[PDB]
Amino acid sequence: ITNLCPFHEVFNATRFASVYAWNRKRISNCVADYSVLYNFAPFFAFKCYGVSPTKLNDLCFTNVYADSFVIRGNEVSQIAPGQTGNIADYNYKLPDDFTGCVIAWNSNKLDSKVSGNYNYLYRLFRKSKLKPFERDISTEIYQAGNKPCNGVAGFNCYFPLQSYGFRPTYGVGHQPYRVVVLSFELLHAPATVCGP
């Protein structure tokens, strides 16, 4: 096993997907080096839910799942097991038995237009709460009240995916924080990704 895991492709990027439709990257045979994760670029806390970054260079897993998006600063606390909210019920679900880490960092210089950013969409209203690790992208109108809308999208029928509306001149908190979550699985399976 001489390949090197491309962690320099998730953190190093320019076109992170939106929260309502994220990208799931699966890691295969390689050797991972966690030094650059915490030794260098300490923008925010490593926020490791299981085990610890200090002991992340000896144990190894089968596959690594990377999920990336951009969210609100005030919504950052919503990215944790056992919590619910406007993005933890219809947008992104974190299982209560989650293992791995979440990395958030400020992205003002990256995602900010003079008028603002509106390409990022998030779902607001939906029938029920999401199952863990499930994607529910769908273009449809919400039937609110007693009026069976047939695509009119008028009164009492609101489009769930709401434009986000970032800003480069507003105070902190609402400024975009880019979040990449790394998920692991330790099981009696043939080892595929292991560090030095």
Epitope: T2, N3, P6, H8, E9, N12, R15, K109, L110, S112
Partner: antibody, heavy 123, light 108 residues
Framework: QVQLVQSGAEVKKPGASVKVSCKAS????????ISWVRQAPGQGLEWMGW????????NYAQKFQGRVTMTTDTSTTTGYMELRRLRSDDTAVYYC????????????????????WGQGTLV | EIVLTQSPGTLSLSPGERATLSCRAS???????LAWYQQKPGQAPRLLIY???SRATGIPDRFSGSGSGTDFTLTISRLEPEDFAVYYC????????FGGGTKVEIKR
């Protein structure tokens, strides 16, 4: 510490094919792609080729599409042009660089550029 | 494709003076996709800046970058006369296109 070396200067006549080698050392030749660029005297650079190393995907420019094909030998960690259809006044220096703009595994755009350059070869 | 526009045709400056370089875009270029390159006589180009102002290799106190959206520039201060090199700027959003270039002279 990173080292990039190539072959010596070559002289060719139109109608033949030119094979150019680029040896790389000092870094793992698996997590970075190879970018091959032209530089002709009196003008700037071009973007002939982008090649991955983990797989065989290429990103040949449409200007030279259908004429450029190059390979990678991971045993020696070398890039080979086997350029065909040589033309008279295409004499220019050739540069091989370790690219940090497109990932070698998944292929999305990166942030960066060309960080290590060879000595270039002349035909 | 996407083409870049440079109009510092020739800089007539003595060493140690302010140096401004322009890499104006055609229609739209993303903020987090750019590159700059030095070019010394009889050598190979090297990477200098890979974004807004992020340094790549050394950059002691002179090389800085700025800009936003569709315009971008590079700033040099206290120019010690060793460099006097050619400057290249590269875009990244649509395929890959180098800039025309810019010559820096001695100002005898």
């Amino acid at each position: 510490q990173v080292q990039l070396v190539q072959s010596g200067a070559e002289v060719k006549k139109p109608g033949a094919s030119v094979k150019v080698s680029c040896k790389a050392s000092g870094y793992p030749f698996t997590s970075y792609g190879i970018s091959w660029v032209r530089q002709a005297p009196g003008q700037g650079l071009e973007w002939m080729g982008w090649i991955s190393t983990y797989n065989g995907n290429t990103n040949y420019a449409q200007k030279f599409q259908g004429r450029v094909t190059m390979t990678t030998d991971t045993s020696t960690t070398t890039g080979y042009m086997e350029l065909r259809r040589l033309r008279s006044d295409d004499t220019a220096v050739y540069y091989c660089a370790r690219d940090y703009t497109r990932g070698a595994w998944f292929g999305e755009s990166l942030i960066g550029g060309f960080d290590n350059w060879g000595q270039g070869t002349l035909v | 494709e996407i083409v870049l526009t440079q109009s510092p045709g020739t800089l007539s400056l003595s060493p140690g003076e302010r140096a401004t370089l322009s890499c104006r875009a055609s229609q739209t270029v993303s903020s987090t996709s750019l590159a700059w390159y030095q070019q010394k006589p009889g050598q190979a180009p090297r990477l200098l800046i890979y974004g807004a102002s992020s340094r790549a290799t050394g950059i002691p106190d002179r090389f800085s970058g700025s800009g936003s959206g569709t315009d971008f520039t590079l700033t040099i201060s206290r120019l010690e006369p060793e460099d006097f090199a050619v400057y290249y700027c590269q875009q990244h959003d649509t395929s890959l296109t180098f800039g025309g270039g810019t010559k820096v002279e001695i100002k005898r």
